Structure formats: structure tokens, C-alpha cells
Design a protein around this motif. Sequence first.
Motif: not given
Lengths: 209, 212, 216, 211, 213, 208, 208
Positions: E24-25, E29-30, E32-33, E36, E190-191, E194, E197
Amino acid sequence: SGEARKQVDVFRQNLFQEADDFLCTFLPRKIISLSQLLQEDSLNVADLSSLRAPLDIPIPDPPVPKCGYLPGNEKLLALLALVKPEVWTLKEKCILVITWIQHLIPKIEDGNDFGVAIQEKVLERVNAVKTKVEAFQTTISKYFSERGDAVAKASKDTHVMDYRALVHERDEAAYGALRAMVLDLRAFYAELYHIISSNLEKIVNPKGE
Amino acid sequence: VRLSGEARKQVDVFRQNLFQEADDFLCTFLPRKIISLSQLLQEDSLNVADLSSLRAPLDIPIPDPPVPKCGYLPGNEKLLALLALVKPEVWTLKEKCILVITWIQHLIPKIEDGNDFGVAIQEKVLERVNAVKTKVEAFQTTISKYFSERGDAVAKASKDTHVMDYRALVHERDEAAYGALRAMVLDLRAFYAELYHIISSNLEKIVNPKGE
Amino acid sequence: KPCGVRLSGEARKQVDVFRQNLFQEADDFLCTFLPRKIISLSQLLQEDSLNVADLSSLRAPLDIPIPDPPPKCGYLPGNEKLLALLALVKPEVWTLKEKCILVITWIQHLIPKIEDGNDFGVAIQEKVLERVNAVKTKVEAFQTTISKYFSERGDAVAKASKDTHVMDYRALVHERDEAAYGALRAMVLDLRAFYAELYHIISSNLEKIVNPKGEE
Amino acid sequence: LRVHPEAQAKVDVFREDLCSKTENLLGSYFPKKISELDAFLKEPALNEANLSNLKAPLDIPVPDPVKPPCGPVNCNEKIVVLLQRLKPEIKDVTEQLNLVTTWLQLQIPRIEDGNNFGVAVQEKVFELMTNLHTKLEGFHTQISKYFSERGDAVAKAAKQPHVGDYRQLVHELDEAEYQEIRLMVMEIRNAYAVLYDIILKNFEKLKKPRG
Amino acid sequence: VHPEAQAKVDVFREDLCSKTENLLGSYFPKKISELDAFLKEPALNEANLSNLKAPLDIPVPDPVKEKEPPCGPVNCNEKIVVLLQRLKPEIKDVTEQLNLVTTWLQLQIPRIEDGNNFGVAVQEKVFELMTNLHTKLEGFHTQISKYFSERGDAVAKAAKQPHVGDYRQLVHELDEAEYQEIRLMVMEIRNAYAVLYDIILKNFEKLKKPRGE
Amino acid sequence: TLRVHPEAQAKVDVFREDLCSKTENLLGSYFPKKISELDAFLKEPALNEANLSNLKAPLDIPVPPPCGPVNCNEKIVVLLQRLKPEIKDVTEQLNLVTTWLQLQIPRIEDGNNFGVAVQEKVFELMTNLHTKLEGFHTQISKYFSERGDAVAKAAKQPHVGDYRQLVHELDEAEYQEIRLMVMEIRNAYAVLYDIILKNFEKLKKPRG
Amino acid sequence: LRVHPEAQAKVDVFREDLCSKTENLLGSYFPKKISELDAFLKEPALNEANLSNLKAPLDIPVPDPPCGPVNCNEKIVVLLQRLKPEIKDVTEQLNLVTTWLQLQIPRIEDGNNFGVAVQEKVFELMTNLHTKLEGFHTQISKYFSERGDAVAKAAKQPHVGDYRQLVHELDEAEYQEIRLMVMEIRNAYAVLYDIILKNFEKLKKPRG
């Protein structure tokens, strides 16, 4: 009936002992050994191109040679030899736990039935684990037949290069599947202990005494 | 479970892109799709009056009662032209269903006891968007199956020349595919209209279910 | 803008021609047609073709040459006795499917405007409509059994001719005949039963099917 | 993030076109189709007195063992001409059913805690439209299945002339297809009648479920 | 009481909880970037679909020059293969981290009690989403083997029957469909990161502690 | 205009009374008689083979193709001679009694539906038996289909010893199935007799 | 309904026989089978230390850039000869006990249906066992069908190495499955013995 009553008491004392030995010593040692198995380099392949076996079918030039012996993927055969016993052992112990809990289900009486309701829900989850473990066995058996058909099509139809890609893709899928099995097997041992140990009072002693 | 400054930003770049893209869908993209699909239904290729005009020439030698080799058998160019118009419209709506599903899932708040009817509305809207996505996935299986089924029908007709039902089958698959492709465009327009209607009607509860 | 349909006299008469024929055909179905089918199907069950004592008498001659331990085959016709029985059963299956569609469409028109309260008559209509559809589904299953007989026996005959050494394919062809007869006799009993059941459920619940709300 | 009336206007144009077209279907088109199909059912094409009239020629040579290639086995003429009339009828019902289904979906109001009897009426009428759609899609696919099954039966009959059941199979598929086509025309007429009936009866709640 | 078994399972759960915080931390996020950034590249944004059309060299015969089968090597679609080489390790990562998070949430399920089961209902609700993602992402795994199988059969039929033009079309349609599917499979992956998370971080109180310490 | 007609009602009641008197004869005569026959048939030495090697038929195929006639299993065929008409009779009387019970279902009413629930519970069993007994009908056709395929493969592939073993295992499995199918048919008669006779008042008179 | 003395006697001959069989099975047969299968599980036939012992000969010629007779796996076949009669017994005694319990279901009454619920709960477990044990009968026939096809494909195409592996994997899987079946049959006897004797009061007399 005194002789025949003694025959069942030998089995029932064996079942309760073997079920207790599973929870105490066997199950935690399986979590250690499966964790230790997951550290190995055969289960952490960095690039899956290393698992690519040599197909060795003659590529026909544009507009006849015999096909040589095409062996199986020896990396996967080594990995399958490690995973297979772990799958068969957990199905063995699921049957033990199901039979153990079924014997702890008391006489059906009206009232004080929440303990019996807990036993049914634990049985329901242990059966759900067994159904997933049976799905792993069908995946393992299907790999050998599907690869054999893929290699047979690739050798028979040499011009079709997608059948060659299918054989190597079947190996990568089987590898990824086999890794996911070992992760699931460790998870099922941890989950089986957690649900049984948390509810052990109501599983063993449902009516309250 | 504390999050870094970069970690929150990386997700906030996605989230605020997602909310903008979902807002652009309902305001500009979706009404334009209703106009373009309406304009597409007025075209001559989709308003074929007599379906005998879709019949492509199946040049296979007819045997005589008791051999010539079969020449190249091309595809139906009228359907291949119509498939090129329909395919992109099917893929785009599946993309936008995924956008709306991801958009609404982010609007689902923390699970609290009480004041849950707004959450119940979100779930029912999410159900209808998934139902539209499932029907859009069924259009893709219909399109992919047409190419394989016609190839097998033409192969059976060329192999078994004496069997004239396989020639009728090839022409029947063309007429069925045409009628399906017309029905798709009508359904696609209806799904854009239905997606707007259900979201716009319930927009307060979708965005603000708790009523904060 | 308001959505408001006002029907022209032409259009209303066109539907009245249909609805009067539907309601008249539904009356004549229950009144005369259905009792006549129970008598004729009962009379059909007393025929000697449908009361075969031993099912091995239905066995047709296969006439495929038997090989010998160390000649190409001639024409192999179908089972005449089953083909004669199929000609009697097929029309009875197609007629009941037609009359199921009539009774469904008839009851559909008797379903009134959906109003809140006094809905038990509407619930009875739905429950009868359910049972009529259930009868139609079993009648559709009889059509799939009849069509599957011709393809399955042809494949069994083809296997027996193509593999002459295998005697189990010869037994399969004869087992397909006995199973088909047993099915076709069971159909005629079920068809008579469905006519009796359709009348019983409609006649018992007739006041609520026709007049669910209780209008005079 | 809020409703924009530019987008609302373009959907309401499409919405009022469906309203006005649904008025024409109930008022004119559906009563007309019931009359056409009633007239079609009474013709002698769908009232064959003897089923032997439908038996097509199947000139496949039966071999004499003491003493393979085959001539062109054509389609059943009487069934094909019925299918040429049936196909455009199937096309019409599914197209108008889709229009009325799309109309009814856009009449569904905001989801609320109560005052949902009008919503229940819409769901009840929508249940019928879904069941009709499943039935009429079945008619669409069965015509392709007929030519597929008959082709396989004729192919097996020519490939295996000694098997007499494959010849019979082709004649049985023809009889069954005629009998099915006859019912499919009845089912199509009944769909127009039952749609016309149920929509007119419940029209106020379908249009305005909460007044 | 079983002290040996209670010890090592708590050591497993504490390590599994530690990895879940890291996902999560940092990891989610890594990813998803990365995805994208991958979606915006020109490999997944083909302006014209004719770019994906691979060479399909099979001899097209005619009966007049015949009066006057063998085939060359039909290769795989190169532009689709390189996309699958990037997609496969992405699919591998989601299924592993979903399995890890699912196993974490299962071990957080407390004793079955008569009441005080709102936190248990929160866990079951979040678990439902993880089960639906697992069903979706397993579908992506088997679909890649299905692509090479279906393309191989289409090419084999096209080679053996060159006169049937629809088999040549079928190969190009399988390529176009696979590219479009790969494009959505990256979006769905990706979703998945997201939504996982989002739903876990919102409900982390009741997932961690369903009965409140 | 639309109503119950006594002329049509009389013709249906002739069938209804005919079906009821037959059902009483099944309870009174046919069902107890069948239980005695099937109990007697179960105790015969045909269905009680001591050694399973007795069932092994000759599979005369030359070891390593032209092949001689591979006959059907004689001991299994003569068991199926008796079993097939026993499957016919039990499905006949089950269908008859299922039809009888359907015609006893009264008007759908708001209350007083206990006798209706009794009919539904007994009808639940008759549906389950019908599903089981239809399975027996189809599996005999499957036996000859599967054995024929095993014999066909064994002749075409003499070197493959498993196809030879498969034919013997299909014979053993079929003999074991015929044993149980006879037991299941006897149990069907016994349970049908039992459940109807206990509940007969509520089945016949659901509201008195 | 009118009673029949001779008809009732024929069913009572079966019903008395069926009841006496059930007392025998709970009293002696079920404990006896648990002891036999426990002894069978501990033998070296079902405790192969190394799985390479189960690998059968597959004499097919390897090509380089029309074979000898491939026999069945001897170690698996002899296990199946012991397993098959154990599958016969457990299914027959389960079928007998299931029939016994159905005849103990009383007349359907508006109240006092707790004993009926006990019968339904115990009947639910017997139906689940019946579904599990029926799978084993076709499983043995499926093994020789799947192995025969694997050996046939291996013989036709000797160059494909995976078809040779498939035959040995089917043997390893069959040994492992046979091992589990013997445990599952033993557990079926134990659970049937356990659940029936606990609830025997309300199974035999549900309303006292």
C-alpha cells in the motif's frame, strides 16, 4: 457388540491423535518447509526465457526431413516433482480434518445449536480448501496432455510457428501456475490452523461441556 | 501504515485524471456518441432494404450428375466494410464501461453502519454498468465467431461441392451477421443513452452517498 | 413533452379480430378439442403397435456381413416399425406445442392492469402460466428426442458397417431402437397426461384465471 | 462534477424520438403486423395438407454390392421460400422490441427508498420484454442451424449411401423445419399482440411511475 | 493449547502484515505510475490498425495456371509478441500481490461469534472484491495461451486450404482483437491496483481490528 | 360464455377415475408382487457371481489389422434381457402415479394448503426417482457404445494392452451396475408403496 | 384406503429383512470394515517409499533424425483388484441404509417435525457419500481409457517425449488416487457408524 465396539475405539483414538498431531507439529513444519521451498532459485526464475526448452523441429524453407526426439521441459519436470507431493499431502490432511470434525458433531438436539453451526462453517471452509486442492491436481494432469498435443501439432505442422510459441507459452503458464500453487498451499495451511485454533473450543466442545 | 509524500501524489495523479476523464465522458463524449451512432444508422450500408444485395458470389464449381479445382474464394466485402465501422464502436464502449466502473468504485466510501442507502444506490448503478459491459463483451464474441464460422462454411462448401446447403449456409451467415451488426449499433446507442440516464438521475447519491 | 396514444377505430378493430379469435379458440380448446384428444390418445394406446410385449420383436435385420477368424456391405434401411410409430406420435407432439402457445397467449391477455391490491387472482394466473410453460418445455424435449433418434441410429449403423468386427455397434443399433420405442410410448402417455393436467388446473382455477379482480 | 444541461438536451431529443415512435408502434404498426401475420398463417404455404408435399428430391445413388461421386443435392424449395418471408418478419419484431425496450429503460426514474410501485410495474413489463428477446433470438440462430444440420445429413448420406437413416434424417429435418416455421410465425404474431396488450394496459405507470 | 503452532503462524502473519503495508505504501502507487506511463506509449496507441497486419505468405492458387500443400514459414505477429513479453510479467505481479493481500485478510478473520460481526461483514465485503479480481486476472492468464492456439489453428487451416479467403482474414482479426484486448488488460491491471489500494486503505481499521482490540 | 362444461368434465373424470383405480391396484397388488420378484432375482446365482473372472469374455485379437468377430459379453447380455423390461415397468407405473397425484392437486387457495404441501413433498420424491430411473435407461446404450469403442481401439492397436483391459473393466463395471440397478428398482417400488400408503388420506383428500 | 393382508406380508418380508440387515451392519460389519481398511492402508502396497517403483515398462523405439506389446501397470492393477470389491461393498451397504432410513420417514404432519428434520439431516450426509462413491466406479474405467489413449498417441508419434511422460504421470496419479479412495471408503463407514448410532432414537422413532 463388546468386541465390535472395541474395533471402532481403536480407529477413533487413532483419528483424534492423528488430527491433534496435524495441528501441533505437522502443519507448522509444512509452513516452514513451504516457505523454505519458496526461497529456492527454481521457484524464483528472474527471466522466464531461461525456462524455454529447445524444440528442435526443422524449420521448412519457402517453396523432407524427419523429426528427431523432442524431450519434455526438464526444468518444469523437476519443479512438478517438488509440487506434486505437497498437493497430495494437503488433500490427505483435508480428508483427516473433515473426518475429525464430523466425529465431533454431537447428537442432533433442539437448542444450543450455535456450536453445531460453527462446526458446519469450519467444515464448509475445509471443503472449500479441498476443492481448490483438487483443482491443482487437474491443472497438473492437464499440463502433460496439453503440451504433448502442442508439440505433436508443432512437429506435424512445421510451417505454423504459433504452435512452437504455444509450447513455450504452456511452459511459462505451468511455471507461473506451479508457483501460485505453492503460495496457495502455504496459505491454506496457515488458514486451516487459524480458523480451527480460533474456534477450537466450539469445534471440540460445541454443546458447552 | 503511514504513506510517503510521493506515494499519495502517484495515486492522486491517477485519481484526479480518472475523475476528469469520467466527467468528460458524461458531458462531451457520450452525447457526441449518440449523435455519431444516430448518423451512422442513417447510412446506406446499415439500411439495406433487400438482404439479397449482401449476397457475395460464391465461385465454387457445381458438379454434374454421374473434376475442376476450386479457385480463390474471397470474403464478403460489404460485411468487411461494415465490420470496420462497428468494431471500433464496440471496443470504445467496453473501454468507457471500465472507466465508469473504476470511477464509481472510488466513490464508494468507508463501510460504516447506518446511512447506507446511498451505498446501496451505487451498488445498483454498478450492477447495471457491468450488465452493459457483459452485453458489449457478447458483441465481441459474435464478431470473432463470424470469421471462423464463415471460413468453416466456405471450407465445407468447397470440399463438399454436391452439398448445396453449405452454399446457402455461407449466405445465411452473411445475412445473420448483417442483422446482428445493425442490432449492435442500435444497442450501442441505447447503452450510451441508458448509461447517462441512470448516472444523471442518481448523480447526487453516486458522488455523495453519505450526504456530507 | 407528453407521450399520449389515442387509437384509431381501424387499429382497434384489427386487434379485436385477433382477440375474438384467440378467446374463441381457447374456449373450443377446453370445451371440445381437449376431451377428444384424451379419447383418441387413449384409443392410440390400445393399438397393437404401442402394446409390444417383447421389445426384441422390434429388432430390424441389420444385414452386415460378419467376418471370420484368420465383402463390402449393401443397403441398410431404417426400422420400419419405429418409422410407422413415429408417424403417429410426431403429429400429436406438434399439436400440443401449438395449443400450449394458444393457452399461454390466451392467459397473457387475461392478465389485467397492474394495480396495488387484489393481486391473488393475478398470482393464480402467473402460477397457471408457469405450469403451462412447464408442459411446453417437456413437449419441446420430446421434439429433441425424436430428431436425435435419426442422427444417433445413422451414426450407430455407420460405425457397425465401417467396423464389422465390432459386434457391440450392432447391439447399439438395436438398443437405440428399443430405447426409441420406450420413449415414444412414454410420450403418448405424457401427452394424454398433459391434456388432462392442463384441463384440471385451468378448470379448477377458472374463475380466477378469467376474472382475477372479481368484476361482475 | 455536476449535471450539464447541454448533454441533457441531446439525450432528451433521442428520448422524445423513442416516445413518438412508440406511439406509432402501438397506434399503427403492431395492429397492422397482427393482421399481416394472421393473413399469412391462413395461406396454403403454411397449410400443407399432406407432409409428403415437402419431401425434396435426394438423388444419391444406392450401390448394388454384386455390380463415391454424387450429383448436386439442392435445398428444399418449399422451405426456402418460407424462410425468405420469415427472415424479414423476425428482423422487424426484434428491431421494434429493442426500440420499446430502450424506451422503457429511459422511463425508469431515480432510485428511491419508497414510492416504487410504478418502478415495479416497469420491471414487470420489462420481464416480458426480456423473455421475448430470448425467444426471438432463438428463432434467428435456428435458421443457420437448419442449413448446417441438413448439409451434414446430406454430406453423410452421399458419403455413406448404404446407410438409409441419413436419407430419412434429411426428410425429417425438412418436416421439422416446416412445422417450426409455422409456429415461429404464430409466436411472432403473439409477441406483437402481447406487447400491444401489456403496454396499453399499464401505459400510465410505464410513462409516469410517480405521477 | 498448541504453543509451537501458534508461534510460527504469528511469525508468518506478522511478516505477511509487514509486506501488506509495503504494498500500500510503496508498491501499489509505483505500479499505477508504471502502467499509466505504459498506456501512453506508442506501442499501445496504434493510430492505424493496418500497422498490426503481419505478413501471411501462403501461395494463392488459381485453376488456369494449375492446368499448366507445401508452404513457407508463417511467423508470429511481432508487434503483438513484444506487447505480450511486457504484459506477462505484469499479470504475474498482480496475481501474486492479490494472493498475498487475500491471504493476509483471511488470517485477520476473528473467532466466529453470535454478535459483534460488523467488522466481519467489512472483511467479507472487501474479500468479495478480491475474489472477483482473482477471477478476472486468471482469465487474462489463460487468454494468452488461447491466442497462440487459435492463431495456430487459423494459420494451419489457411495453409492447408489456401482457396478459403476467410481463414486469411481470421488470422488478421485474431491479431487486431488481441492487440485491443492487451490494451484493456493493461488498463484492468492498473485499475486492480488502484481499487485494491482504495478499498483497503479506507477500511483498514476494521480489516486490521474487526472487534476493536 | 366460458365455463366448466359437464360433457367435457365427464370425459376427463372417466380418465380420472380410471387412473385412481389403477393406482389402488398398484398399491394393492403390483408393487408388493414386484418387490418379491426382485428380491428373488437378487438371490439368484446370475447376480451373485462369486469370482469376477467368470465374467471375463473372450477378446480374441491376434498379438503383434484383419480381426475376427469380437462378440458381446454373454453373461452381461442375459442380465440386460431381464433388466430392460424391469426398467420399463418401474418407469411405467411411476409415470402413472405421478399423473394421478397431479390430477389430485386442488384449486390454488389463500390458506388451508397443508394437504397441498403434502402432495408437493410426495411429488418431490417421484421427480427424484424419475431422474434416477431415466439414467438407468441411457447407461445401457452407453455401455455398448463405450465397449464398442474399446474393442475398436483394441483391434486397431493390438500392442496397446490397456484397451484390452478396458473392455474387461467395462464388463465388470456393467455387471456391478446391473446389481445396483436391480436393487434401486426394488427400493423405488418399496419407497413409493411406503410413502403413498402413509400419506394417502392427505394425497387423495388434501382439504377433506 | 382398504387394507390387504397378503400384499402387506410381501412388503413386510422385505421390510423385516431390511431392518435386520441394518442392525447387522451397525453392530458388526461397519466396525469390521474399518479394521480391514486400516490394516490395508498400513501395508507396503499402499505405502510406496519411492514413486519410481510404480514406473512401468514402456518399450517403444526412439527415432533418430510398429512396436512391442505395452502391458498394463502390474502394481496398479493388483491394487485395483483389491479396491473394486471394497467399492462394491460400501455402495451396497450405503444403498441399504439409505433405503432403511426412507422407510422410517413417518406420515407428514403439521407439527412435531424435529425427528423428521433429524432424518433429513442424516439423509443429507448419505446422499453426499453416494455422490462421492459413485465417482470411483467410472474413475477406474477412465484410467484405462486415458492410459490407452496416452500409450496409443505415444506409439503413433514416438518423437513426442511428453506422451511417454503422460503415461507415467497417469500411473503416479492413479496410485495416489487409489490410496485416497481406500481412506475415503474407511471414513464413509466410520462417519455412517458415528452419525446413525448417535441419532438412532429419532431415526428409528422420530415422534417417540
